[PDB]
From Swiss-Prot, chains A, B, C:
GO cellular component, one term: virus tail, tube
UniProt organism field: Escherichia phage lambda (Bacteriophage lambda)
Domain BIG2: 161-239
Gene assigned in the entry: V
Protein name: Tail tube protein
Quaternary structure note: Multimerizes into a structure formed by 32 hexameric rings stacked on phage baseplate gpM and gpL. Does not multimerize in solution without the tail initiation complex. Soluble major tail protein interacts with tail assembly protein GT during tail assembly.
Task of the protein: Forms the phage's tail tube composed of 32 hexameric disks. When it encounters the appropriate initiation complex gpM and gpL, it assembles in hexameric rings that stack on top of each others. Multimerization ceases when the correct tail length is achieved through a mechanism dependent on tail terminator protein.
Subcellular location: Virion; Host cytoplasm
């Protein structure tokens, strides 16, 4: 894949930011940074929790009601945490101290062992001296929200192909009327029941499969097209129904 | 929309006047000003409270009474407030000090985050040195009344379309007489009760809907016209009653 | 900067006046004083509130009206406050007591932690014994108005440089007539819409940008000059329109 699969390869190994302010794109290619500098180490890191607020905006379901005086607060979030470590010998906690003086938004990247290297932005939400015990100097900083470049159609739809031997109606229907495409089957040596035909156009038509028939409903004008393919291509049949403009 | 919707995106962000005296229209397009100059900053700004006086003119409901010696005061308002800030480095508080010397009516515009950029006029109702604490130099000025360009028919009336299958009376009535238009209904699979027919002309006629009938009242001569449309256009019927000139 | 930026470094730390009467400039360089003497301590100090009066001079918007008998009061202000402290061991409250006898206007300077060291003048608006509790001897004095040396053009105007590829009209217009400068654009890999050209001379001409064109209006005679520069200097084009003397 690229990133998304549900496997558990925990966390750790101490790789961490990797700050930048630079000039360029802070949400697309983060690997063009000229500032690109290690600050320290990580002990381990919280998940990426934004979190939220994220009002509603208070729907109910009480008293009807007349007007009546709603509110909202939207203070977005929620500051995102992680736990640092540093060794005397590593050089960068002074540039964390400089962040307390600076007060500004600094961008950064963190390697995950979870299959990504995500981009962060944030401000100095905890600073100064840190817990020391087994010589590592350990504390936290808390940070902010990210862009989203994710599609949902592509990646594509699965094997919708429990086909059947359909006899097509192939005949015009009145606008808003339903019609039936008869199902034959010969399931020799097997005796199936998995069959489940799929319409091409759902915008202007719809279909229900029950009763040993395909009920196609002419929701709007033109052509409704149902391609019935079996399995891995061992059978295919195409049927349509034309739908009136009135 | 344009401006009017009931959402709460609070206030602030320090944008402020933007004074003019110029020449042109001080109540229609305020964005043709050649004087157009920032004075300072705003900390935040009061709502637009005029306020009022706005007498009555003292109706009652005591002693009948003979003549008897009423008064009025009408001193309109009421001076409208807001809270300024300024930094040494910003240049304009000297032109606020000049307003104390000048004494005159100055026009201005203020950006709101409330979806508008309203036009103000007013005079120097507070001046000189201001409260300083966190280096901003903060005070107030208080100002005056605005024009109104708002219609109420347009924006138009809502879906008055809980129709019914009416049988029309379609027959002349005497001037000032009432008449009945019978209601049939077939509400299959549903069993409604929402039905509520609407007259076109209310100037010279009126209608009451109760009792499973439409009582149309021939208030003045000519035609009274009742168009009964259902829902989204799934049924429509038109009925009229002619009303005598005598 | 020099002083003006909107940061909050609160107040306190007990540094305070620093009186003078001397001879020299009481509003430009206040650091040439030969009188220059600490009086005491400050607990903390009110912002610099003058305040005002600052009449108007009562414009309305009632009764038309014939002549009719207005007034004014202009009693400028408004006396400006601050809260003193003193320790037995500090030597200067006796010279505050002398101020009660003297009755006169005394000049002074106060260090702020707000990035300035502002100059004051005033008179003894509260005197004698003071509140003691945690051994500091604490009270107030109230004082008066200051000069203003602030420019507004300089500091200069921001990056007015959302340029465009203009084809210039470059042709004389009649006095008071409008004319159009056509806009081309090739925004490859980007698809912009930010473009917003700026005239040099607004005294004798004006310009509106809408409709995918630049409408330049020949308000008075000579040349109107529009320099269109993009961004950081990646494109530039200069266009003019000559305007008739009649």
């Amino acid at each position: 894949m690229p990133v998304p699969n549900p496997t558990m390869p925990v966390k750790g190994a101490g790789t961490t930011l990797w700050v930048y302010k630079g000039s360029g794109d802070p949400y697309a290619n983060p690997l063009s940074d000229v500032d690109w500098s290690r600050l320290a180490k990580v002990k381990d890191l919280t998940p990426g929790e934004l979190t939220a607020e994220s009002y509603d905006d208070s729907y109910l379901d009480d008293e009807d009601a007349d007007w009546t005086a709603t509110g909202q607060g939207q203070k977005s979030a929620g500051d995102t945490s992680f736990t640092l470590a540093w060794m005397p010998g590593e050089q960068g906690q002074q540039a964390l101290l400089a962040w307390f003086n600076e007060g500004d938004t600094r961008a950064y990247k963190i390697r995950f062992p979870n299959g990504t290297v995500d981009v962060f932005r944030g401000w100095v939400s905890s600073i100064g001296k840190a817990v020391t015990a087994k010589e590592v100097i350990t504390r936290t900083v808390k940070v902010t929200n990210v862009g989203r470049p994710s599609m949902a159609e592509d990646r594509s739809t699965v094997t919708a192909a429990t086909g059947m031997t359909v006899t097509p109606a192939s005949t015009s229907v009145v606008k808003g009327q339903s019609t039936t495409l008869t199902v034959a089957f010969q399931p020799e040596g097997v005796t199936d029941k998995s069959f489940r035909a799929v319409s091409a156009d759902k915008t202007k038509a719809t279909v229900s499969v029950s009763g040993m028939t395909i009920t196609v409903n002419g929701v709007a004008a033109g052509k409704v097209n149902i391609p019935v393919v079996s399995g891995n291509g061992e059978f295919a049949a195409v049927a349509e129904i034309t739908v009136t403009a009135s």
